[PDB]
Design a protein around this ligand. Structure first.
Ligand SMILES: C[C@@H]1CN(S(=O)(=O)c2ccccc2)[C@@H](CCc2c(F)cccc2NC(=O)CC(c2ccc(F)cc2)c2ccc(F)cc2)CN1
Ligand SMILES: [Cl-]
Ligand SMILES: [Cl-]
Ligand SMILES: [Cl-]
Lengths: 99, 99
């Protein structure tokens, strides 16, 4: 699809058997999801930007379905104000910026 | 152009006759740049990021060139980690997400 930017580019995602709304964010290096359980090992990480830093749990090799496109990658889980799909997963679905 | 997301989508912008590097961010509602001098009056604005909210200075009808495309709009100035081009200006330059 072609997504215009008049409003926030929110899409439905499927992760860990759950349906969630997430923002497609080209400014994000990583994907960050609100508190939820994920299977496997994890390691602590700090991520930051506007307003400072938050502590998150880093889970690797997690499958996410974004607009019917399956992608696998690292997913950070923590107290984010919005679920963010970052570049690590946007590349996998072949998402590009065009103008 | 078509910009892939394997690397950060950093572009050259020109504001107040100076060249600066900025990130094209579909996850940002507004454009925020690091401390600099801008003309006219400013209004108060709060923007929320991953770590919480910060106060910024809102300047309207600012001339800015983004990757060679002319835009005229709202520019926020504050303690941002990197210069960010948000949806208010990405819409002006005709930017869309595609997959
Ligand atoms: C990764 C980059 C950099 N920042 S960041 O916090 O530094 C950061 C996020 C992760 C990892 C590193 C850095 C974000 C934009 C922040 C931003 C600007 F820069 C300039 C102007 C406005 C804003 N804020 C918004 O537009 C609000 C928005 C939002 C999006 C991501 C957030 F995390 C927090 C809040 C929102 C969306 C839906 C909702 F329901 C509630 C809020 C996202 N893109
Ligand atoms: Cl990854
Ligand atoms: Cl590619
Ligand atoms: Cl504007």
């Amino acid at each position: 699809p072609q997504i215009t930017l008049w409003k926030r580019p929110l899409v439905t995602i499927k992760i860990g058997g759950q349906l969630k709304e997430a923002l497609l964010d080209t400014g994000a290096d990583d994907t960050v999801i609100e508190e939820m359980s994920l299977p496997g090992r994890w390691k602590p990480k700090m991520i930051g930007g506007i307003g400072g830093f938050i502590k998150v749990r880093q889970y690797d090799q997690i499958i996410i379905e974004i607009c019917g496109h399956k992608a696998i990658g690292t997913v950070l889980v923590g107290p984010t104000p919005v679920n963010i799909i970052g570049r690590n997963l946007l590349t996998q679905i072949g998402c590009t910026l065009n103008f």
